């Protein structure tokens, strides 16, 4: 019996294949008159089409980190910044000095950050430039002179100086990253949940369901929930330093808004230009005062330890505090309302909660809840996109900026090893690891519809 050759067309095969994606957006989040900015510009609309054609005989394998779309999740917003960059104002093109210790303010403000200044060595050396209120917001006062410092303008020695103004858009728009036909995205979803070995429930989708990606240093707030169970992933389990992703079947908040109500005192200094001294008098007790109901908080953590058991059998869990450097790593960062979050989260990740066969040594919430409170930082000049040397000033604003929302996962790292006492430090690490959340359910391929096999039959000749 011979082996001739034969060809087949329309046959089912798809390739593991890198490709790069367009973004689909809500075309009424932005609006018709707000031309010439990234979301109104190159990002296209959306028309959702879940169409999840189910698959016996699928057998694909996965790793969370083999994906390339993670890079697009760090890209894009540089164009949102650049298409919107406000210039250096005439008061600020050089390292001017400022003098204060108590605040330049209308009142004895009971807020630690508004230690406001005059401008002093200032362009013309003229009262019209100097006497203007340099509103402070804690992260200020770069030292110049060794005593009684005439503080340096902190932005003057980095490549970008720029301003946030209330007209300039920011919004967590629902976004989808997508690629044309013949390519397909495969979503994988066996309750035996994987992203790591084989899979057993799969179908194509034209794009992911929408996601609202925004940065954090500790807590995956407003993330997509898991279901049935908590889960953890961290690549080669012999590894110490490389990030552990913790993902939740329940959720809990962090109890503060952005409460610091302030006046609309912008100063129209320079030719069609501004400084936003928007501070003083109104709300001058309203520091961020963040708080913790231990019950639901500790419950989720102790549940997480009862999962960590599975990765570290018959030995007892513990935690250690987060890193310094930029105190964002010690705290948080996120934007809401143009205002940024920096309360002492590292105060929480603590005790030696036991994993012996135990009915104790796993709680502090006391059923009384205690409603504990923690010290908070603030910043008016922000590193507007992380790692990069850029800096931007942003105004404090009137009323309550209400974001106080819920957590669906943790950034986590191990701290070496010792006999029985396994332990971890929360947050920090690769800021790309935020986007690994949920995206593990998806990967992209190219269809390749033709092929060949041997056979026991021959063409006419």
């Amino acid at each position: 019996e011979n082996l001739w050759v034969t060809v087949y067309y329309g046959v089912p095969v798809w390739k593991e294949a890198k490709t790069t994606l367009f973004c689909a957006s809500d075309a009424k989040a932005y609006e018709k008159e707000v031309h010439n900015v990234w979301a109104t510009h190159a990002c296209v609309p959306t028309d959702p089409n879940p169409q999840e054609m189910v698959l016996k005989n699928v057998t694909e394998n996965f790793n969370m980190w083999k994906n390339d779309m993670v890079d697009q999740m760090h890209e894009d917003v540089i164009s949102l910044w650049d298409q919107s960059l406000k210039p250096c104002v005439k008061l600020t093109p050089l390292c001017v000095t400022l003098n204060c210790t108590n605040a330049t303010a209308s009142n004895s403000s009971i807020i630690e950050g508004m230690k406001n200044c005059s401008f002093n060595i200032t362009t013309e050396l003229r009262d019209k430039r100097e006497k203007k209120n340099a509103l402070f917001y804690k992260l200020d006062i770069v030292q110049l002179d060794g005593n009684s410092s005439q503080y340096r303008l902190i932005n003057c020695n980095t490549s970008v100086i720029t301003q946030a103004c209330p007209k300039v858009s920011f919004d967590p728009i629902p976004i989808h990253y997508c690629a044309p036909a013949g390519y397909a995205i495969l979503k994988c979803n066996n309750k035996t949940f994987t992203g790591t070995g084989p899979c057993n429930n799969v179908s194509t989708v034209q794009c992911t369901h929408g996601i609202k990606p925004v940065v954090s240093t500790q807590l995956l707030l407003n993330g997509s929930l898991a279901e049935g169970e908590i889960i953890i992933r961290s690549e080669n389990i012999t590894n110490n330093v490389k990030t552990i992703i913790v993902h939740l079947n329940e959720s809990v908040k962090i109890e503060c808004t952005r409460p610091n109500n302030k006046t609309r005192t912008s100063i129209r200094i320079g030719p069609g230009q501004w400084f936003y001294a928007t501070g003083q008098v109104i709300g001058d007790i309203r520091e961020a005062y963040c708080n913790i109901n231990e019950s639901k908080w500790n419950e989720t953590l102790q549940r997480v330890s009862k999962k960590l058991k599975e990765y570290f059998p018959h030995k007892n869990i513990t935690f250690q505090p987060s890193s310094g450097g930029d105190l964002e790593i010690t705290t948080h960062s996120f934007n809401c309302g143009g205002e940024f979050f920096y309360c002492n989260t590292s105060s929480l990740f603590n005790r030696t909660y036991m994993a012996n066969s135990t009915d104790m040594a796993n709680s502090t919430e006391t059923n009384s809840t205690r409603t504990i409170t923690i010290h908070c930082r603030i910043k008016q000049i922000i590193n507007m996109w992380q790692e990069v040397g850029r800096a931007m000033y942003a105004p404090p604003i009137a009323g309550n900026i209400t974001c106080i929302s819920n957590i669906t996962g943790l950034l986590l790292t191990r701290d070496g090893g010792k006999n029985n006492t396994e332990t971890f430090r929360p947050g920090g690490g690769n800021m790309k690891d935020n986007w690994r959340s949920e995206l593990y359910k998806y990967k992209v391929v190219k269809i390749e519809p033709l092929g060949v096999a041997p056979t026991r039959c021959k063409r006419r000749v």
């Binding site: 890079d71 760090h74 330093v241 790692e387 990069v388 040397g389």
Partner: protein, 105 residues
């Protein structure tokens, strides 16, 4: 460009990063060593990738600002100096400011 730290410090057999942090608009990147003033030694042949010289203890890693070298198993050679090399602004070539590494303890 291309700014670098003057040094960083971690102890024997531990691990650390160096990165190059200036006008890193160029985005395929390489890294190099000099030690005791001898002829410079390569590390990274493109930003995540290395040949036969030190094929385990070093590692290459991607970021837009921090063109990043990551190092583990720190030993008595790690008193050397280390440099980034992006490709340049078209038909052009660059070096980093260097980092004289200082393994402590």
């Amino acid at each position: 460009a291309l700014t670098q730290p003057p040094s960083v410090s971690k102890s024997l057999e531990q691990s650390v990063t160096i990165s190059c942090t200036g006008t890193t608009t160029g985005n395929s990147v390489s890294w190099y060593q000099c030690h005791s003033g001898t002829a410079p030694r390569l590390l990274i042949y493109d930003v995540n990738k290395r040949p036969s010289g030190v094929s385990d203890r070093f590692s290459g890693s991607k970021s837009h600002n921090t063109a990043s070298l990551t190092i583990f198993g720190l030993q008595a050679e790690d008193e050397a100096d280390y440099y980034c090399g992006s490709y340049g602004s078209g038909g052009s070539l660059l070096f980093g400011g260097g980092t004289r590494l200082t393994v402590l303890g």
